[PDB]
Amino acid sequence: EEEIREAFRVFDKDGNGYISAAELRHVMTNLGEKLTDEEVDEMIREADIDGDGQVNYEEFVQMM
Amino acid sequence: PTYQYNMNFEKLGKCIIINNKNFDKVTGMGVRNGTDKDAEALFKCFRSLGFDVIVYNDCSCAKMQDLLKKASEEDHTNAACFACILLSHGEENVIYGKDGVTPIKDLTAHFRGDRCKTLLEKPKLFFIQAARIPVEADFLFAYSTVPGYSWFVQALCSILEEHGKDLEIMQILTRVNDRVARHFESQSKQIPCVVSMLTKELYFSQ
Amino acid sequence: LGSGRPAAGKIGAFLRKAVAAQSYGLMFANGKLFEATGDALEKRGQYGFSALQRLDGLSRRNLAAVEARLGALDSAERGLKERIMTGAWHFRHQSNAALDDGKTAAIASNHLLARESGDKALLSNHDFVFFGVEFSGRGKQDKPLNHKHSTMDFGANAYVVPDTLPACRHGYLTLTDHFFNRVPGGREAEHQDFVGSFPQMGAETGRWIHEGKYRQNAPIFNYRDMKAAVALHLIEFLRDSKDAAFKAYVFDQAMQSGQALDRVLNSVFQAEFHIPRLMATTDYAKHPLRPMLLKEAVDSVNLPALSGLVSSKGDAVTAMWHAIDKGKDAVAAHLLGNWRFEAGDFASAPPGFYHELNYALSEHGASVYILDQFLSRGWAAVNAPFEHVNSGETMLDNAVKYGNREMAAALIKHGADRNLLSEWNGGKLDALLA
């Protein structure tokens, strides 16, 4: 449960907080579990609370 | 009198079908889905009986008033009777137009015996379907306040398409009340009411 | 190459857990049925993980409810439970639209189509993809046993996915249709020959399925409790059943075969599986069950299939009328060039169409594209009033009646006499032009 906060930070584009949005797109497109490219669109839609092109992994786990 | 309305005319009469499916945002009412299927069933059914059915979809309150007003001012000498069908929302003695509400008394206002001599001594049929009263002479109302998934219109057509030319009008509407009463039990005890001011029996001969 | 490659699966397992929490968040917050039973939830802009925590909370309540109803299970009943517990399932979704391309099958829900452009207020579960559950376990490429769910033939193509897909970890199942929770009688059941061999059962199938005090409280179970629910809810029916022939077919022939078990579970219930938001995968199976018809493809916009369904100029005209009524633009575009009609082709009214040409083009929800391309070619009169429905009114009458600003703009652009409207339209036109 608490280890999920560490899960996003292992491949953070910077160091703390903001993660690249297009990075998470290509990560699920090839690396990790072999996901489908049609599903990738809907995952980033609800993820990016900013609604432009970034990842807020710290606040997203806290909000949900 | 033969205790039976005279049906020895050219045309059986006029039949107006009001089918208000969509309503304005000012009214705060939703779309009546499936009422296009009710309007199609009522058309081919009353046309089979012998009426000159004309359909009007999504009429305003001023359109509905002038529509029946111009209808009552027509010549009904060669007409055996007259029928009117209403498909819209309703509350208490009022139905919903696309832009507001109008009372039932104003829809039957210009159809009184003094204001319509050509339809005098002839029955004026009124079938109302209102989801969520004037007493004259030779008038009949079929008031139904039960929404359907409608059961009333489908039960009325299924009987008129089977016994519309052999049974009396009360025998038809009585079996309609029993058909809709069966649907309350199967769920797939609200029953419409029949207000009758008829002086004779109503049959549908040519 | 450290511990990041396995941990990369967290991204995805967390996003599918957040996207699924939104579809259930719409069901609990906006569901009218869940307020009567109190199972509703709060309102948020982005529904959190508490929506999924109430899914497990609701599933454990319904599981413990049927568990307390029976409790003492018979020895032969314990074997039937493990039979269904160990049986892999195949979920079937039917439709008429080409939802795959030969590599990936993407099936969107009824709500995801709205962001791109009654029952919806009662449940608010339209953010889920509907599936008919088959319990054969004879392979994903095996022929679909059941063609209809709740007497509804959805389409001619069946998209089958096994329960091994990761998206099923967050789905839920209802014993029948979540809205209409009444498994029909024997006369309405699909496989009539199987039910006909068991008489005393056909009178007990026509029932309402529920759990709570309200009749509409359709039982809801999560993936962890699907098999334990349909098994116990079946035992609850077998114990109350008076049929000596059917109470022996479930303990003998149904546990041996996978086809006999499906015929039992598809007749006692009408299982409905739901997957949130979207169901996109490459591991699936598409079986063309029946031939598709003309109207079937026009409504679901299946243009590749529509190319072969039209073999004459009459079938092309008939297909065009269906696109005008249902309001499909691309369907009219393909029929436009492949078949070159004339003005007199669409002059009359086809059989089965209770509206005429001019009124259908001006109906509520009609497409300006279907209308503009129809007036540009001149295949219809511009100001000829209707002679069957709303007589005495023109095209612009309906355009201003419903308030469609774009439809009124193209009608005047083709030369619509602004003085041909009735009194109930008058000068309201200027408020819609600009």
Residue numbers in the entry:
A (entry chain C): 83 to 146
B (entry chain B): 56 to 187, 213 to 229, 239 to 277, 286 to 303
C (entry chain A): 45 to 161, 171 to 487
From the reporting publication:
CopC ΔN50 alone was recalcitrant to be crystallized, but could form a high-quality stable complex with Ca2+-free CaM and caspase-7 p30 (C/A). The ternary complex (referred to as CaM-CopC-CASP7 hereafter) was successfully crystallized, and the structure was determined to 3.6 Å in the space group P43212 by molecular replacement. Each asymmetric unit in the structure contains one 1:1:1 ternary complex; two such complexes are related by a 2-fold axis that also relates the dimeric caspase-7 monomers, forming a 2:2:2 CaM-CopC-CASP7 complex. In line with the two-domain architecture shared by OspC-family members, the overall structure of CopC takes a “V”-like shape, in which the N-terminal domain (NTD) and the C-terminal domain (CTD) act as the two arms. Caspase-7, situated at the open concave of the “V,” is accommodated by the two arms, but only contacts the CTD. A CaM molecule binds to the convex surface of CopC, acting as a small handle to support CopC-caspase-7 binding from the opposite side. The CaM-CopC-CASP7 structure shows that CopC-CTD (residues 345–487) adopts an all-α structure consisting of 9 amphiphilic helices, in which the central 6 helices (αC–αH) form 3 consecutive ankyrin repeats. The hydrophilic faces of αE and αG, together with the turn region of L2, cooperatively constitute the major caspase-7-binding surface. In the CaM-CopC-CASP7 ternary structure, the C-lobe of CaM and its two EF-hands can be well modeled, whereas the N-lobe is omitted due to lack of interpretable electron densities. The C-lobe of CaM binds α1 of CopC-NTD that protrudes from the turning point of the CopC convex surface.
